[PDB]
Symmetry: D2
Subunit: 289 residues, 4 copies
Amino acid sequence: NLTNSNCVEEYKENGKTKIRIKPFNALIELYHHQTPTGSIKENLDKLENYVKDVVKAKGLAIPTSGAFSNTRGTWFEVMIAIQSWNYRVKRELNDYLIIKMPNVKTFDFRKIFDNETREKLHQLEKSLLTHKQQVRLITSNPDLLIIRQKDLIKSEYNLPINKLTHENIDVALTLFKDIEGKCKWDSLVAGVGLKTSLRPDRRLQLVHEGNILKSLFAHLKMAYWNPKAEFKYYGASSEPVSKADDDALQTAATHTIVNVNSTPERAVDDIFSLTSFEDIDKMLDQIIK
Amino acid sequence: NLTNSNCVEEYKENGKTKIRIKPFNALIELYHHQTPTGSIKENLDKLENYVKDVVKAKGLAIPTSGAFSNTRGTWFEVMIAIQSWNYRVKRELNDYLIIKMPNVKTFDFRKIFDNETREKLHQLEKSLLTHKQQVRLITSNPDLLIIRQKDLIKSEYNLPINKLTHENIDVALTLFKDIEGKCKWDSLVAGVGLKTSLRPDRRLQLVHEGNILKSLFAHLKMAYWNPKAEFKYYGASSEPVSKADDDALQTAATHTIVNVNSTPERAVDDIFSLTSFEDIDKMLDQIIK
Amino acid sequence: TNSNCVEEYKENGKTKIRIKPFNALIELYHHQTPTGSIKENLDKLENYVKDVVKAKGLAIPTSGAFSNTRGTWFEVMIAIQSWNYRVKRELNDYLIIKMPNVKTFDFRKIFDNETREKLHQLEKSLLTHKQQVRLITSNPDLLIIRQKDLIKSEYNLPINKLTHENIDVALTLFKDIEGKCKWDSLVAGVGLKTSLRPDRRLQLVHEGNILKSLFAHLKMAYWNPKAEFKYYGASSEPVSKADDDALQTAATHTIVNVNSTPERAVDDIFSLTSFEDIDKMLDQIIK
Amino acid sequence: NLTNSNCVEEYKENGKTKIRIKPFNALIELYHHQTPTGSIKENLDKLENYVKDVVKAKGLAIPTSGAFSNTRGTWFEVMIAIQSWNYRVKRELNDYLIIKMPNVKTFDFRKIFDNETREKLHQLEKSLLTHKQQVRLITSNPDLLIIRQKDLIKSEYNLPINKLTHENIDVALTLFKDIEGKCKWDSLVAGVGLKTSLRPDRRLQLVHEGNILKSLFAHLKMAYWNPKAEFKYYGASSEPVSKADDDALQTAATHTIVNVNSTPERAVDDIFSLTSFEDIDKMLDQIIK
DNA sequence: TTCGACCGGTCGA
DNA sequence: TTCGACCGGTCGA
DNA sequence: TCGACCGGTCGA
DNA sequence: TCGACCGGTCGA
């Protein structure tokens, strides 16, 4: 029956036949009866070998690492997205949302804000571009956003996802649409960058991400002159985090160490090593409370 | 013939036979007649095809795309270090040095500084760790460092490298050792991140680099209360830079936009698309002046 | 003697003599607005009083009873002199207002509802600390506003004689603008002093510092780098290099970073010898 | 015996016969045997009468309150400089000095610093002048300086002053000379502005004082990147301090409230109402610890 | 078709 | 070994 | 000439 | 009562 799987799709491109992995089909096809749990890494290899056996059975050629790197990325994100969906359900956080975000083009995360907040950000933008050396504040959407605003929770969000289905995955991955233009600037409490693995270079992308996000938030705090609002950014790896990874992720928010009296603040507040799905819950516990 | 090449080396690891690319040997072997010129890519391709032909001849396994990623980066950097070495020579700057840097563990770039400057850095970095929330300022060594300090130029540096040889390469790649602990903080004028290609995520590593580097420099300027001193960071790609790449690289140094009065500054001052070796000269012209 | 420049009030069965500098202005200028030497015109108002008592059977008002009065007079002169300036200058979108004390009318009141709010945000925030902090300074003697919709045709009628109303209309100009000034419509403030002392001069650096500090926060709330406020000083006497140096003290908040470009609390100090100089000063201030 | 006292003086101011209150001698005569104690407020009035009785007696006119205001202030600063000196004696702070400072011209307080610290200040004050809009950091010397540096205490400072005599007063008023060029920047812990009375305008001179002093200290902290060092400025009045006086003296250091996260600070940390010599000790107790 | 964001497989020290 | 820094091959929108 | 002090107001 | 003004010193 593997020859019937859809985790891989064939197509021609410029007369060239190519095979494409469909990460969601592999998910749906393996977890439609119960949602994954246990060791996250095993689930990633399980999903990967599955795709490899399906392709082997279809008589197609094993996808390149590039394909698997991409795919594994998605798998990791969705598993975390679903686990987060259920997390707030069983933890009964009726004023919190943990959203898996799309890329910045599909939906620039700045869109989640109410119009007053969107105006302040525009103020700053147009301003930074109004110079000899035009300046911007760009960063990829954070993988996960954690919002705390009661009036945004719809009763349907309280229905746990107990199996991976086109429908269930879609509701999780489109949850972001519901909050568009409705969040008060300080309703945003934290962001999380997800990475199946780290590298001396890639891990720095987390620091950049937390830095630009916290720089934006810092400007909203001044706009609304509110020193108590706080935004934290976190990183999560499915593998062990070395000391080197740790130190790197302790990098200060350059805008927070300008002054000798200024208090240091890390771009990435904390890095989590998620070995099991239970750990996702523990991480969220530490992030949210 | 090719079966005699050394661009590829075989070895066993845990009873498993593996083939390793030796990027330098491919360089030396393809350019001991004359140093590369023209289209940077056609050259990088030429260097890769050569690694594959030697592999088919040797009967060995065709190296993974991950092995050609690592390697290709090594080639780009090297092909540049050489062009820059002869650049300063053919343009005549007995006060400028363009150094290809090793990784931060082999030689933390902070070591290029004299004892007084390195102490100011210690003060800061020791201060940042002296908090409940420990903070650091970590970034990979910039690929290229441009120093301007007359007393550091040795007459040997004026001997152009006209062919790639174990020595021609080593002298270029060990040039950094000579200046250890001898640079005055403001002798450092610019850094350059080199990348054969960009990606929406990787390109942000340049912004992080420039940001942390400029943050450190900003603190030295404070330390020596010298508003004149500058440090600029640049990015160089061997491929076309899209409008998206551009905008992303216009990201400001968060620590320069804290105040409504603070003049915005870019983490990466400019991004260069280097199609030919002549462009490397043009880039350097704009950077140095 | 029939004059009202002076008075004689009861204070614990110890009859004392007060001066109503106002009358000593109208009663000495119902004719016309003084001009020429600010120095000499000041004494004219003083001898007019040194007499009202020398022929009314009274005693000499203390050096200080006059210091107070000598100040006022000085002020009203510049104050009234600025009215005939805007008019005889064509500054229809400008107002030069002689401010009352911060109690009578806290200058923060000149701002529209949105601006006054931002200020509340801040000054309320500053009080929300274990160590409560404030941003207090006496109202600047003179305020220069630039907002077209605040000019009323009556402001264009020059004052060519000092009368209870000419005074009263000037010393109340601030009322018309209350709660009507956009934040960036404030262009400058000026400190007036007949003389300067090494200690008293530091009050202008403070005045300007607290004013600029405030305005600075208005610039950040509206993220508008362009807007700017300036503070100036004015002595009816010479200014020594020590007064100049002291008055060069930049804003401690404008020199925090070795990159931030410095600014002075008091942008410039003017020595006004004649009424002709008041116009010159205003010319430089208004740009 | 009054008609020969030295508390006054008749100098020739272009013809006119003028009386120059000679303040120091008026203390030395009322206190030729013991230190003034009990009530400051009162002790001031008597000092005023004695000198106000050596006048009419000698057939002269009671010098103008102007000369008295000038005179009165000094008596206050002097009495304080004395109780302050004996104060560290009875308490025995063998590493503390409470110095009555001369005007900034006679001895610019910046002179108390060692070479290195004076250097840093020069950097700054030279930099500020290097602009289109020349800027300075000027303030009158603080009335009282409190230094904490063990190696500056000479055994001779431990001999309490029990009576006001020319030699005594002068040892107290020249104590500042001893420490010239010897203090480490952070050895300076607090300054105190003394005023027999306050006024809505004059009290703001205290705020300016503290502000400029704290601004300078702030730059030294930067210079030596030491966030631990702290300088406090206080005000002391011989009369009751109204709520208006209080609020005014609550004005913050414009340079500590530039950022929303910036933690606000007062130019004048606290204002003391000194009714008795008893209170001078109490004030110092607070200040010093 | 282009752009966004993902990461795994190195070679060298 | 592990740690530093490199980047090319995706799948989705 | 300059530094730093403050007490005696007039008005609200 | 509180706001803001400044002129008359004594010393260096």
